[PDB]
Amino acid sequence: TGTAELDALWNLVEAQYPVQTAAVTTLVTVPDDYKFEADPPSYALAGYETSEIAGLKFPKGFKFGVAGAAIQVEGAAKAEGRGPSTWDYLCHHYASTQCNNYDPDITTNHYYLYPLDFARLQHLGINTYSFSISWTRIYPLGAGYVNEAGLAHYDAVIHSAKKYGLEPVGTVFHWDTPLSLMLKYGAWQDTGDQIVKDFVTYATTVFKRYGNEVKTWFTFNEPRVFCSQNSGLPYNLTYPEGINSTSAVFRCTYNVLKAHGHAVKVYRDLVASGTIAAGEIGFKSDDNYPIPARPGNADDEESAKRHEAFRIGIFAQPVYGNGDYPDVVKETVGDMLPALTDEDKGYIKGSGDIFAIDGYRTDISHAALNGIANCIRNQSDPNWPVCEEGSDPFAHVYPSGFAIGQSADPLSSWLVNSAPFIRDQLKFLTQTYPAKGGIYFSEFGWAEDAEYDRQLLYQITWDGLRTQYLTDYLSQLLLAVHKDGINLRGALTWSFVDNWEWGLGMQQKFGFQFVNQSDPDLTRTFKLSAHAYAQFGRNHLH
Amino acid sequence: TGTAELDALWNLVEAQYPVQTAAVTTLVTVPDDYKFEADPPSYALAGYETSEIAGLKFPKGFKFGVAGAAIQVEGAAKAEGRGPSTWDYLCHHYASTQCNNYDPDITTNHYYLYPLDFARLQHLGINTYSFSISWTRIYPLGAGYVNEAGLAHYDAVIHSAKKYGLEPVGTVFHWDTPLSLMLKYGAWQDTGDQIVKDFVTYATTVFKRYGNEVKTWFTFNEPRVFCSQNSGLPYNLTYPEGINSTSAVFRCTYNVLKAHGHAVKVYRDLVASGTIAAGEIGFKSDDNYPIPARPGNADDEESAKRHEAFRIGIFAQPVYGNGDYPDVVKETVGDMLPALTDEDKGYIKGSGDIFAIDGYRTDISHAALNGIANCIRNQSDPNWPVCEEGSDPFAHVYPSGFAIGQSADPLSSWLVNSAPFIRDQLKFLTQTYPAKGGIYFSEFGWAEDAEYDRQLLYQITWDGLRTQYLTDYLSQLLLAVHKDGINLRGALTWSFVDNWEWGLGMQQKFGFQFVNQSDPDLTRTFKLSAHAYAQFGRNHL
């Protein structure tokens, strides 16, 4: 049951409709005479940068970069021995209900186009490329046999990136759970510890393979967001005895923390044995400490604390703090979240060299209107377990009725331009979750208003709100370094391309380049925001 | 026929479905101590104003205001003896094809809500209110009997505006052609001169009635755009002998120029009589002088000049220039455009005290791809008569492939944020079309990216691209006064409310206030752009 089981799994994934194949299935050669599209006019970036950041530079060695993830950009879902993820299965069986009639078969075809992508990032003065490794390219069944062609693919991607002057930053796991492990024992809902062994075997292989060339690592991308998806399809089809939709989240939380700790131990041992280069390893946190709706009101103060504990604290306190879950989380979820043993704390405590925040926005916290005490006691309460008002007319709105900032578009309504709150977030995170190597802004970006292929190219490429958000956000990071003394190591924008955005597929556009999904070649065009990003780097790096 | 003909015309308009009646049919006011919604947070306008306008002020008496039009804001289409317009007919008989399933029966109900509207403009520091008079409120048949209740309505509107400290600026005609004149002789396609007499009697009545209180007047709003609409429904149903869909445009152009000249002579004589206050009269021009796609290319340079001649020059050269049509226009359209006589030039030449430009944006001019020369000599050519590439991938795009600026929603894709080109436009207009009283920016605004009946109120009210456009555009007007010495008299944003935008009805949002079309009260909410506008006034008046 090797390539034999691989076939079986793809046959199960493809029962209703097959994996589609890209128009281009060969590594692209950047041609000798390749012409970038002309620059926008000279006045186009006028008015974006304020005089307040005149003369401010990021520290020496600042990582000024872009971020993508394997399943969101690569395509080639079955190429060169790749096994299926939970998402391959979800989008081929539940496309209309869970996947917005898209699938990750092809996405941006970055699997074959990366050389061309890197020549275009080099044109913009980008100096860092954040990627994820597809677990099922390396172990198509999550455990057992190794796919050499997959290990060779990322060698070639890392080598290309360095030639184009992009420092490679690697993420081991960006939500693409191997389907085989889900079917065998329920993957991250495993009540045993085989998920931890299988993850650690995988992390060991990619660290040995790449960590002479990759010296900044993230084990997990946004583990809090990933564990919340384990409450639904396709994970809820395979729960072990004792797991339901509520407990699966907290089972996943604990297994991810274990996987992380054990993986960072192998990373440090490989460094200590001289097998790889001395580098830095952490994981990507997300979300925010919200502002209370009514300053000095203890209920809104409490609900904002509960938000931070469940969205950030539940992973960051064990790793960068006192080595245990927030007491607020323990008191609320009880036995559903397995106790960290002395042995667990042995690996997890101190297992972050660097902090990384996906600092997209900051929220407002209104205490649950039915009362924090009532909400805590009822797991069926829609606001459980944070027990603030979680919906859009509360999360983003002052008591005044006015928003915290610009909204992104109803499909991405969690996203606001909240640049003025960035310094407070960084101050909180570096004091509460201190790391020796400091802190990354590891993801930030805009899903732009009209552009959802409503349009002609000239309307798409002048992306004023994206350009505003990225300049806002970069400006505030500069001031964090210069006014708050933040040890900020980098800024990585999501993303360098419109890509496949999970349940929303290619309808959500996060790129500073447009990808033409009606063109066989999936041709990239720079938006104004890509030139805004380039111009900010030339002006504020050195 | 009097009362009798009014009835007949409404029965013709209402054949398929009647005029709808607002849930509010009484005057809406607010007490002095009424609480407006709370301001945005203190950081909300950070970043919009550039350091290069720090401490610069507009001239003393600068009109800092908003613009609406009777049919786009009032509703009350049949209240107090109003007669039907061509648009009342068009949207009741061809709603699905010509009107996007809307009609001007109700729009924002400004006819009854103006006191509330004025209290809210006062909260923003607005000092000027630009409005149009509905001809068919005054003469329900365009000619014959006068409707006192309609004259009384605008007295009460003008009085309310002045009490709330808004200088009232009056437009006599904003496209709302009386249906009766269209049916009788074809209105603006008249090959007689009854349209000129009927307009002049109307203009005379409103000038005597209001021009003690109103001291800035525009005869016609965007006459070039209005004459363009005379090529289609419902005007093309009633053309006199010898008028086409092509020739209708140029017949309308000529009759409007005559109407204007005769009406300005009445206005000056009224001023000289002392029976109204000494004021200023002009008309609102629109459109732009575009930048050639390939500067120094003779074809794009020519097509840019043809654009200016046919979109601005055809009205402004007779009035503010040498008193004749542009030579490029005459050589192209021939006898479809009636020759101006010595007598016509007698009234028309010098008939603008003030220039007014609806300066929403600047285009790019690409010469017709089939050849400028081939296009001019056709008439069936879709790019005739300007003979540039008229469509969006040409009018807004450099040969580079990058736009001239930020685009508005595809529904309003004619609109770009082209603030950098504003000073060049004002320079060209004041030098080419000089007026003694100077120049108004009489309309500018943004149709914000798909905010329409899709969203929650917090999402609507933080309108970043509207806010950006209005601050951009106010900044450049301020700099035109300082850097170029432009005698700029005012800046009037379109509009103070989401309103009824002709063919698009209430789907296109131009307001710095949201109007809730799912609320019986049509409740107004300030957008951030309204506070941006208020803050700019406080900082730079």
Ligand SMILES: *[C@@H]1O[C@H](CO)[C@@H](O[C@@H]2O[C@H](CO)[C@@H](O)[C@H](O)[C@H]2NC(C)=O)[C@H](O)[C@H]1NC(C)=O
């Ligand atoms: C697995 O989780 C999915 C994701 O929520 C559940 O989804 C919905 O559940 C409701 C309750 O019946 C259904 O009516 C919805 O229509 C479901 N949506 C879809 C896409 O199926 C689902 O109930 C769960 N399935 C199991 C077996 O527990």
Ligand SMILES: *[C@@H]1O[C@H](CO)[C@@H](O[C@@H]2O[C@H](CO)[C@@H](O)[C@H](O)[C@H]2NC(C)=O)[C@H](O)[C@H]1NC(C)=O
């Ligand atoms: C999901 O399983 C958890 C246990 O993992 C359930 O939570 C407990 O429910 C029992 C009753 O079955 C109560 O006596 C306990 O107080 C609850 N425990 C905790 C830790 O709160 C939960 O009820 C199940 N959820 C669903 C949807 O059936």
Ligand SMILES: *[C@@H]1O[C@H](CO)[C@@H](O[C@@H]2O[C@H](CO)[C@@H](O)[C@H](O)[C@H]2NC(C)=O)[C@H](O)[C@H]1NC(C)=O
């Ligand atoms: C817990 O909150 C939930 C949902 O907000 C409530 O669940 C309902 O309970 C009633 C009454 O017993 C049932 O008839 C409904 O069918 C339940 N489901 C939903 C989705 O509303 C419940 O009211 C809350 N429990 C407590 C003790 O406050």
Ligand SMILES: *[C@@H]1O[C@H](CO)[C@@H](O[C@@H]2O[C@H](CO)[C@@H](O)[C@H](O)[C@H]2NC(C)=O)[C@H](O)[C@H]1NC(C)=O
């Ligand atoms: C996306 O790609 C398609 C595929 O080429 C583009 O479509 C072409 O548009 C040009 C002129 O603009 C025409 O000559 C061709 O007829 C089109 N080809 C096809 C096969 O449709 C499309 O314009 C691109 N879209 C954007 C927004 O850039």
Ligand SMILES: *[C@@H]1O[C@H](CO)[C@@H](O[C@@H]2O[C@H](CO)[C@@H](O)[C@H](O)[C@H]2NC(C)=O)[C@H](O)[C@H]1NC(C)=O
């Ligand atoms: C008046 O103009 C309209 C178009 O503005 C004409 O009606 C349209 O004509 C086209 C071409 O024949 C049709 O295919 C459309 O479906 C028509 N539109 C509607 C809503 O009916 C109309 O014929 C013109 N009238 C005259 C007298 O020439």
Ligand SMILES: *[C@@H]1O[C@H](CO)[C@@H](O[C@@H]2O[C@H](CO)[C@@H](O)[C@H](O)[C@H]2NC(C)=O)[C@H](O)[C@H]1NC(C)=O
């Ligand atoms: C009425 O429009 C017709 C088309 O509906 C136009 O046709 C031409 O008339 C011109 C006058 O400019 C003559 O010089 C030509 O012989 C006609 N031929 C062509 C190919 O256009 C007409 O121009 C309009 N009529 C008038 C008198 O202006």
Ligand SMILES: *[C@@H]1O[C@H](CO)[C@@H](O[C@@H]2O[C@H](CO)[C@@H](O)[C@H](O)[C@H]2NC(C)=O)[C@H](O)[C@H]1NC(C)=O
């Ligand atoms: C004048 O312009 C018209 C309108 O574009 C031209 O008509 C098109 O030209 C060719 C004739 O070979 C046809 O394939 C198209 O079907 C015509 N359009 C329409 C709407 O029927 C016309 O040929 C031009 N005449 C000259 C002398 O240049």
Ligand SMILES: *[C@@H]1O[C@H](CO)[C@@H](O[C@@H]2O[C@H](CO)[C@@H](O)[C@H](O)[C@H]2NC(C)=O)[C@H](O)[C@H]1NC(C)=O
């Ligand atoms: C426009 O006004 C309407 C009418 O009051 C509002 O309608 C309410 O809409 C909310 C939408 O979340 C509903 O839950 C309410 O029950 C509705 N009431 C009625 C009578 O329909 C609507 O919210 C307003 N919209 C905006 C953006 O302000």
Ligand SMILES: [Ca+2]
């Ligand atoms: Ca700015």
